[PDB]
Amino acid sequence: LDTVYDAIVLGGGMGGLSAAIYLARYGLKCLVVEKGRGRSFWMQDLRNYVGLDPDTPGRDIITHSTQQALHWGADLLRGYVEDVTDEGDTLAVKVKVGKKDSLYPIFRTKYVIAATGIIDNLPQLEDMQNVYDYAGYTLHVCMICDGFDMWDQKAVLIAGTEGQINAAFVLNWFTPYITVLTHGLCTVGDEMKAKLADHGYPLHEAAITKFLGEDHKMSGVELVDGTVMEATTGLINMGSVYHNHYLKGIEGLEWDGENLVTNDMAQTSHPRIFALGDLKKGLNQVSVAVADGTLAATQIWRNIRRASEPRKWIH
Amino acid sequence: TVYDAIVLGGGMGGLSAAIYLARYGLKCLVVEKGRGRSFWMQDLRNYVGLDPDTPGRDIITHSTQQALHWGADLLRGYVEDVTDEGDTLAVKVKVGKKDSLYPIFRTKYVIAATGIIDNLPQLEDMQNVYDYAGYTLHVCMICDGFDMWDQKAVLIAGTEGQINAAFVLNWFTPYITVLTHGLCTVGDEMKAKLADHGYPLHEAAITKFLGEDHKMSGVELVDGTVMEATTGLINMGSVYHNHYLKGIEGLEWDGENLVTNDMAQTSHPRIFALGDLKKGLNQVSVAVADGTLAATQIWRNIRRASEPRKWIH
Ligand SMILES: Cc1cc2nc3c(=O)[nH]c(=O)nc-3n(C[C@H](O)[C@H](O)[C@H](O)COP(=O)(O)OP(=O)(O)OC[C@H]3O[C@@H](n4cnc5c(N)ncnc54)[C@H](O)[C@@H]3O)c2cc1C
Ligand SMILES: Cc1cc2nc3c(=O)[nH]c(=O)nc-3n(C[C@H](O)[C@H](O)[C@H](O)COP(=O)(O)OP(=O)(O)OC[C@H]3O[C@@H](n4cnc5c(N)ncnc54)[C@H](O)[C@@H]3O)c2cc1C
Ligand SMILES: Cc1cc2nc3c(=O)[nH]c(=O)nc-3n(C[C@H](O)[C@H](O)[C@H](O)COP(=O)(O)OP(=O)(O)OC[C@H]3O[C@@H](n4cnc5c(N)ncnc54)[C@H](O)[C@@H]3O)c2cc1C
Ligand SMILES: Cc1cc2nc3c(=O)[nH]c(=O)nc-3n(C[C@H](O)[C@H](O)[C@H](O)COP(=O)(O)OP(=O)(O)OC[C@H]3O[C@@H](n4cnc5c(N)ncnc54)[C@H](O)[C@@H]3O)c2cc1C
After folding, report:
1. What are phi and psi of B60, to 5 degrees?
2. Which of A59, A173, B5, B180 has the fewest Cβ atoms within 10 angstroms?
């Protein structure tokens, strides 16, 4: 009944587990809520993170850091965050527990760390397994992450909107051999079609029917209109769904598009809510998310420490 | 002939920057002197993905190999000076310890990632300190506070500002004894505050750390004082490895730290600063992320000034 957590970490991914590790090692009472199978879970090769081999899967990191978090004293709840509500001095966090016959317990806490990230939109094919066979292997979702591994390859840019097609003029740094596929989504305007033609990047607007290859290595793409092309890699640039629905009930949050605006310690405009990694305005990388968790946990500790009574040595 | 970026220091922040720079297709040089602060870290306690007993030296070997794998160049040397040539910077490196040469490299950008090194109490034989420093004698409260919880500890602090750490360390344990190691006499006001909190104060120089297998058991002072303690925190300041910036104009400082923006960029346009050199928390995670942001800003600068790569048909 009375039990109030010092902080509840929403999402047990890269940024969340870092925050959880620090929170527990600051002697604070914290809870991690993880639904499972998040974005980092679909990462097959973490390419650019100090200390880890460049073929480490995200799932192995999640397993490692979850055990570490528990080892230091964090609590873990496997469930789905539904809503966060403001009770003034504390926040209330409702969690869906159980996929079938679910229970919706409510937890109270001094602080919330929003670390639930995003999930990339994928092209909808008749059988999504054809996409999963390559997505995260040779079909990439993050240019910073895998650009080097695409160098001078024949690539496809899968982009739904005119703003998403503009990535071709950054991706060309890594390879000029870009073919744009709209997957039959928004029609391309004349001004953009002329720019692509001026750069030499072919454009195909027919819906994609199948990705060709074997052993997770792309070899080509086929469209509904019979078009067939050769390509050994690609970039998905179709936007993302943001895992921030539980914040509907919170007032006073400041946004930059779909991203939360945070200060240097990853604090939102709401004094008791922090936001990490892919949810916040800034670069979307593992290293950046882990550091956000470090700073958020440290700011929370500083708040709680400075409001507590000094621990004196009684003689 | 001209590097896209030169990374000064091949530690936590520098090797991250080098990894990203190389994977951005940029020509970058890492200058590493060897045996830095992270080299003396025995257990990285709080870093996502790594076991909490991982030594810093093992990380350096791993990430240096990765940096080289992606195409970064490595020079084993000592950065001596950085000069501003306008469109580029010149970086002089001492190569060779006994018979040295001073080659000069030019670059569009410099990443200052040479960190700091903690001051240690000077004993007759420094090995007595090294036996415990980084094991049970800590230099970073955030790093090892949890591992000190409710233990009898010593705070080794030279100045009144350094003694003030006792009023943050008390969060982890109230059983703090302050040792000034005979460096600065403590004022009456601070003596009264320590007494009110119950933290004993000893001002005599330390002679020996007691214990076995890197596990502290006590401390002995020159005046014969002996005490029991299983851990401690060194708070005697640090030497900053930023001497090579003496000639540069337009840099902003906060104390000994360089002031940087969100992409770890210093007030000078072509100089970035990472990790322990910059104002902010001193952690591995923070340093690694700084290297990510610096490398990404440099790439954006160079990319946006380059000509688009077109597909010729
Ligand atoms: C590069 C990449 C590769 C991918 N590869 C694959 C793949 O190979 N196979 C695959 O399946 N997917 C893959 N995905 C993910 C896929 O695209 C979909 O996003 C995913 O299948 C959605 O899962 P879901 O429908 O369960 O949605 P979720 O949002 O995970 O769940 C939907 C609902 O389930 C309930 N729920 C979820 N978790 C819990 C819980 N712990 N407790 C209680 N209730 C819960 C909630 O009501 C929730 O709203 C990949 C994604 C990417 C970006
Ligand atoms: C294929 C692929 C490869 C990549 N490669 C790299 C790389 O090489 N280098 C790099 O820096 N970055 C890479 N990234 C991106 C990187 O994974 C993200 O930037 C990083 O994971 C962000 O961390 P985060 O903690 O913000 O989000 P995540 O790590 O995704 O963590 C969020 C967690 O929250 C959980 N969650 C979501 N909603 C709810 C809810 N309602 N309730 C409870 N839990 C919830 C999710 O299941 C997930 O586990 C890659 C991404 C992909 C898809
Ligand atoms: C917690 C902790 C534990 C420690 N434990 C130990 C220990 O167990 N053993 C130990 O020895 N030290 C240890 N140290 C480090 C110690 O305190 C001193 O900082 C160290 O001995 C200084 O080395 P140095 O005199 O070579 O100084 P440096 O600054 O490393 O070198 C001094 C000079 O050498 C030249 N030089 C250095 N490197 C190069 C190069 N690659 N090429 C050309 N010239 C170069 C330059 O002119 C430079 O100015 C520890 C430090 C800490 C914080
Ligand atoms: C004993 C100990 C335990 C620690 N434990 C933790 C922990 O558990 N968690 C945590 O987050 N942090 C810990 N830290 C702190 C952590 O090591 C630093 O925050 C981190 O190393 C900062 O990275 P950096 O790249 O800024 O500095 P460094 O990692 O020190 O990198 C700087 C590099 O520059 C080189 N260099 C210096 N001067 C020159 C020059 N003139 N020319 C060429 N090269 C030069 C150095 O040799 C070094 O390799 C610990 C520190 C110590 C001493």
Report:
1. -60, -45
2. A59
E strand residue ranges, chain B: 2-8, 28-32, 73-76, 78-84, 89-94, 104-112, 116-118, 137-138, 153-157, 176-179, 201-202, 206-212, 215-221, 226-228, 231-235, 238-240, 253-254, 257-258, 271-273
Describe the crossing of helices B284-305 and A286-307 by its angle, rounded to 10 degrees.
130
- The Cα B74–Cα B76 span in angstroms is 7
Q: Å from A274 to nearest chain B CA?
A: 17
Which residues have C-beta atoms less than 6 Å from ligand 2? A 10-16, 33-43, 46-48, 58, 80-81, 115-117, 120, 136, 141-142, 145, 243, 276-278, 284-287, 289
Q: Coil, strand or helix: which one is A228?
A: strand
Would you say A160 and A124 are in contact if contact means Cβ atoms under 8 Å apart?
no
Q: Which residues fall within 8 angstroms of residue A147, CB to CB, at 6 or more apart?
A: A171, A173, A174, B23, B24, B25
Rounded Cα gap, residues A143 and A168, in angstroms: 11
The SS3 of residue A296 is helix
- What is the per-residue DSSP string for A160-213? SSHHHHTTHHHHTTT-S-EEEE-TT-SPPPHHHHHHHHHHT--EE-SPEEEEEE
List C-alpha distances in Å: A28 to A72, B73, B171, B176, B241. Answer: 10, 43, 11, 21, 35
Q: Residue A180's CB: how many other CB atoms inside 10 A?
A: 22
Strand partners for A34? A78
Cα of first residue to Cα of last residue in chain B, in angstroms, is 32
- Alpha-carbon span A294 to A105, nearest angstrom: 28
Structure tokens at A173: 């740094």
Which residue in the set B171, B288, B311 is minimally distant from A201, CB to CB? Answer: B311
Answer for the pair B108, B271: CB distance below 8 angstroms, yes or no.
no
Q: What is the secondary structure of B171-201 as a DSSP string?
A: TT-S-EEEE-TTSSPPPHHHHHHHHHHT--E
Method: X-ray
Q: Which of A154, A157, A160, A155 is nearest to A168 (CA)?
A: A157
**Strand pairing of B215-221 and B226-228?**
antiparallel
A residues 171..200 contacting B (CB < 8 A)? 172-178, 198-200
| Resolution of the experimentally solved model in angstroms | 2.0
